[PDB]
Structures are given as structure tokens and as C-alpha cells.
Design a protein around this ligand. Sequence first.
Ligand SMILES: CCCCCCCC(=O)OC[C@H](COP(=O)([O-])O)OC(=O)CCCCCCC
Ligand SMILES: [Ca+2]
Length: 784
Amino acid sequence: AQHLLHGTLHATIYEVDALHETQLYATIDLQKARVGRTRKIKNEPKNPKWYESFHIYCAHLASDIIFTVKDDNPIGATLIGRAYIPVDQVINGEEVDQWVEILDNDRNPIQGGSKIHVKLQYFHVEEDRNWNMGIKSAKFPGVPYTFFSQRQGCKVSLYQDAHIPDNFVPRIPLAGGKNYEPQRCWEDIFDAISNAKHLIYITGWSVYAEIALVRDSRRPKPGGDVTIGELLKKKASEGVRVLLLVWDDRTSVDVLKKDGLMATHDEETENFFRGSDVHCILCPRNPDDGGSIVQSLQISTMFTHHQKIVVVDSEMPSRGGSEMRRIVSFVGGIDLCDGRYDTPFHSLFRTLDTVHHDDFHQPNFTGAAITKGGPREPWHDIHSRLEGPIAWDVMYNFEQRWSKQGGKDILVKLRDLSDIIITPSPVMFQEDHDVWNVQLFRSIDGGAAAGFPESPEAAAEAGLVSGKDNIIDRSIQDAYIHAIRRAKDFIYVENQYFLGSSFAWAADGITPEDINALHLIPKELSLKIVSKIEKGEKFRVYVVVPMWPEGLPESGSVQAILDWQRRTMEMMYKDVIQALRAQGLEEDPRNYLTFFCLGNREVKKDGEYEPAEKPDPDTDYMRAQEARRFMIYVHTKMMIVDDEYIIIGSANINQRSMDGARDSEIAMGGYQPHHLSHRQPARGQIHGFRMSLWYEHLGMLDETFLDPSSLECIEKVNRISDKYWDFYSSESLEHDLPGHLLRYPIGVASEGDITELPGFEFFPDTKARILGTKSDYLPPILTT
Ligand SMILES: CCCCCCCC(=O)OC[C@H](COP(=O)([O-])O)OC(=O)CCCCCCC
Ligand SMILES: [Ca+2]
């Protein structure tokens, strides 16, 4: 490991020239990091011949690029050769077109001649016209090598939580002279469902038919008390085509109940719509490549369809009148199930006799229930509404899924409604300063979605890659990579998971190549920080994660995940410290990369709901109840870059979501072309949205928050978050927490190692190790 390939590797793998029911393929490694594989080409034996374009994104230390030729026959797997090509030949720019050799294990050659042929060419990241330049013009063409292309003429409504009460957001001034206006997710979903006339298409990891979408007594909507299940049956009865694709976890219902069993009522919902006009379909999810035959058998009950989609037809944005319809779609992190309704208040105890009395979510305690009291787990999340042509791309993703894994041939035929539902159309003129350019992205494979291109040439144009048994759409990871690479001022992430780039982890008690969390997001982040230190340019990265991922915090799963997270932070912090040290700067690396979680703490006021019962005596449950504090769960999957570009979707920053062929995901990336930060700072809708989230978490607006690349900003934000952690973790309680953003409770050693905060080996009120524990039982494929 000596040279750094940070950029893009164009490669074509041609043949072997010799040698002496086969299924034969070839893989590309960068030293030990797999970055590509050809298709299994089959019957053909001696001179097997693939010609596969590869567009590879690199952020790797390497001495050699290595091609391995292998045979995967079910009669038995088998390695053939191993070609080397020192990266020295490739760092320069160049176009290495060798007829390189197919060698063996001691590194002398295989049978008697040939010799693999390959074409390579490496572009460092600075070759890209947008590296360190941002979106840089309203002519920006989008992310390349993706299945969906950028759309123009779109409108995006950014959703902070499921609901926002009146008089919540402060005055946040935006470019056109107007103040930021907050939108209401579930209010808008209720209206879109209520008003549909032709189609309603929904996919979820969980749909619970009993939730009511509208609950704010000071913002009442007629019919709002109806449950989503009864709303959909009413709509279907009128003749609207209501199609649902809800994840089928293929565990049967566990009739018994230990009470932070979070269950995806999948059988219950399918049953709820039986005999109605709603067509609900349980949709199984089998991954593409499960590893061992032994490994595959333990894991293939455990991968999910994770897309949260609602698609409806809606009336034409319109003054009057009259006749016609468009398509409107929703994507983000918010499923239509229990535990997801919340507001930025994120109350622990003060809503249990109002909006949460029959929607009590708390899976981190054994046997938590409303009858025993708080704290509930509050739900911070982010969603979006997409109008304009982009809405039809989400609809089309549903159509590909329904055709491959759905039910009867009952998709609404838009060609038959050409006189009612328009073709995919702008909702605004491109000259309107509110207009959005939006592009859809996915993690999905050919086993879950019909209609992917077949020829390897058409696949590579869409950025699709060959899997074990299916073609793979990984445009979500690619969209994150480009969004990070073009970043020039700051990145703000809120995500449920933050772990990956395991090829660059320290071999510390693990064999890194075993982990296979190969997506690049954490490495592109730290490489981006590194490059701005080197240029003397200001840059900051803020990351908001949950205090711990949902579940009992001592459970093997949570502790495994917290250990992956710790190794990812540790690798990043060593990149940043090494770069700082290389400039002879002695600085706090937390002034360049800073990690947060969320928390609440409420005093007990008179007249609060008093539960009848009580947790058991020395439980995590009882401690939390007495300390009056708990985490605010970060379910967000969102990244804001430079106040000008935003990604919202279902995809977590882990290998499960970023791989392509594990869970199925969806996200949108967008910007407003008239509100870029190329020469001014951007002050459009994405800026107002960031400021509203910051107001929610920090409890205040501050001048410094306008420019988060400034040192003054990151410093003020950390300092405040340190004070909130002290308020949070203190045993005494004088007053409510003034904000929610807590410095993530870890310390960074002077060399990058992650250390425990003195006195906080365990999260407050728990016996769960903040630093995580590697599991002996869970395979990395399940937890990364
Ligand atoms: C003992 C509990 C462990 C705590 C963290 C994992 C919790 C979990 O598996 O959550 C369910 C998850 C999808 O739902 P959500 O997490 O997005 O609400 O299903 C997924 O698709 C995500 C799985 C990601 C990695 C964890 C699985 C071992
Ligand atoms: Ca929130």
C-alpha cells in the first residue's frame, strides 16, 4: 500500500489469450479491495472473452491493480490465475493497454503461455470539471452513469419530521424576499391520497393500517381521523387503483410479545386488505450474493425492501381549472407505520396522553408500554414531495417492481389515459427562481425490478454493474460520491447509520477484507477534508447519527454496529490528523470533522400523564424514566452540501443500503438552479431547510450558522453541543434541555484512536458500551 488512487478508473477487461458447464468470470482488485467483476461467461471454456466497460470509483491505497480469473461452477468453485499491474504504471494519467500475464500463487506464471489482456486509465478527482467547484452552474447536467437522468422543471417540498405545528419555525429570510415556510409531510400525504382519482401506489418496509395521518388538534383536516387503512379502502372503492408493495419478512408472526418487539405488520396488513379493492402484495427480498452457501442460508431471511414510496395522481397546478391530472410522488425515510409520527418538539413524556397515547414506540427497553410510561422514542426523520417529471421516475420504479415481484397485470396504463394524465411535465418554467432540477437514484438489482438493460454496453452507460446472479443499480452510492467530490464549503449529514470504507480500516482485531463494507462514503469524506487542508481552504463536515441504532443497546447487533461506526470514525480521524500534521498544524481535528447524536430531557410538569404502572426496578427502563431523558432517534437519510444540493432517501450510510444488491433503496438528489453557491452563498429552499433543522436541534439561530464552512460556526456548534451533552448526562436536572444536539459521547485521542469519555463507558442509564463490541455470532454481511 503506497499510492493513492482517488478518482475514477476506466477499465475494460478483454480476454485471456490462451489457456489450458463452466461459469467463468474475472474480478478487479485494488490490492485487497474488490472494485469490479465481469459477468459469468458460461459455457465457453478456453479463450472466454467478455468485453465489459467498467467505470470504477477509487479511494484506495494500492501497490498493484490485480485481476483474478475464477470459475464458480456448482460442481465446485475454483481460482484460475492472478494478473498484476503495478499502479505506478497508472498514476500518471496515462492509458495502459497491456497484454498482461495470468499468473499463479507463488507468482510464477501459469500454463505455458498466456496472459490476460486489459485496458486501464485512471483520472484523479481533480480532472473532473466540478471537483471542489460545487454544482457551479444551472447548466449542470447531473450525475453520469445512472439509470435515471436529471429532470428539470420540478418542485421539491422538503419535510422536517412527519409534522410541524404552527408557530414553530422562526423567521428565516430567503433570497426572493420571503421567509422560509415549513411543510407538513403527513398532512400532504393525507391530501394526496384523499384526492387521488386514478392511482395510489405505495411501497414500505412496514405499513401499519391503523395509523392516523392527521393528529394535530390545532390543525384539523376533515376526515383526518380516518386510519390509512380505511382511507385506502375508501379510495379503492371509488375506482382508484390502489397498489401496495410491502416488505415480506419471512418470519411468521410471533404470537408472544416482549414489548419493544418492533414488528412490520406485514401479514396483518395483507390480511387487512384481503377481500377489499386494495391490492396489497407482500414482496420478498432475496439478496444477490450472500457469500458462502453456509452463509447464504443464515442470512437470506434478513434482507429487506426498504423503499418508502407514495405515488398518486393529482390536480393540475392551476388557477382554475380544469380537467387534468399529473403525478406526484414522495420519497424519504418515513414509513407509514407506528412510531413515525412526531414533530420537532420530540417529546419524551408530554404527548403520551395526546398524539402518542395509541402510538407508543420504544424498542430499546424490555417490555416498554404506554401503561408504564415514558420515555417514548421520539422520531427525527426527513422526507420529501417531488413534482414535475421526477414524479414519473418514482412511479416507474414502482412499475418495475410490480412487474417483477408484484401481483396481477393491473398497473394503470398511462397510455390509455393520455387525455387525462399528462405526459411527464414541468410544474414551473425553468426561469422561475423556485424551480428544481432533480434526479432519482436507487439501490436495486435485476431480481427486484424488471426492465434493466441487458447488453453489458447498455448496463455500463447506466452505471449498472454485474452481480453474482443479477445486474445491479448502485446509483445511490454514486450520487453520494459525486455530491461529496464536488463539495467546496461544508457537508451536513444526518443518518441512521454511519459506517463503511472498511477496506481502509485498521487491521485491529479484525481482518479488514472480511468485512466487505466497501462503499466509499466515509473515505471520500475524509479524503475531501484532507484535500482542503492541503489547499489552505476552509471546509467542514458535520455528521448527526443516533446515540445508538434502534434496539436493546447491549444486544449483539447494536454493539456490532457501534463497533463498525467506531472503526470508521477512527480511520477518518487518522486521515484528518495526518493531514493536519503534514502541514505542521496543531489543531483539534474536531474543528474539521465533528460527530453528533440527538437527545431530549424534560422536567416533570404538573398535570403530565401519570402512568398506572411502572418499569421493573433496576432496568434501563426505570433509569430513563427517573432521569427524564432519552435519545431522539435519528432515522434521517439525508445529506446537504454547500447549502445548494440535497439528497433525501431511504438509504443509510452502511453497506446494506449503499451496495446496490442488498436492501432495495431509493433517493432523490436535487438543487434549485437559481440558488447555487458559485459566487454568492446559496439562500434558496435548501438553505432555509438546513437552518430550520439547525434551529430544531440547536434551539437557536445564530449569525455563524449562515456560513458553516467558517471556524467560528463549527466551534460555536461544538461548544453548544458540549453544553447539551453535559445537561443531558448530568445526574441533576434543573430545566428542560434547551436544544437536542449532543456531541457524540466519545473522545478522539491525539493520534485518532477513539476513546471513552471518562465516566461514560456506558450510555447514560444503560450498561451498553458506547464504543461497541465486535460480535462472534453475527456475520459482517448482516451488520455492515
Ligand atoms: C437489536 C437491534 C439492532 C439495532 C439496529 C438495527 C435495527 C433494525 O434492524 O431495524 C430495522 C431495519 C429497517 O428499519 P429501520 O431501521 O430503517 O427502521 O431493517 C433494516 O433493513 C436495517 C438493518 C441494518 C443493520 C442492522 C441489522 C443487524
Ligand atoms: Ca425532528
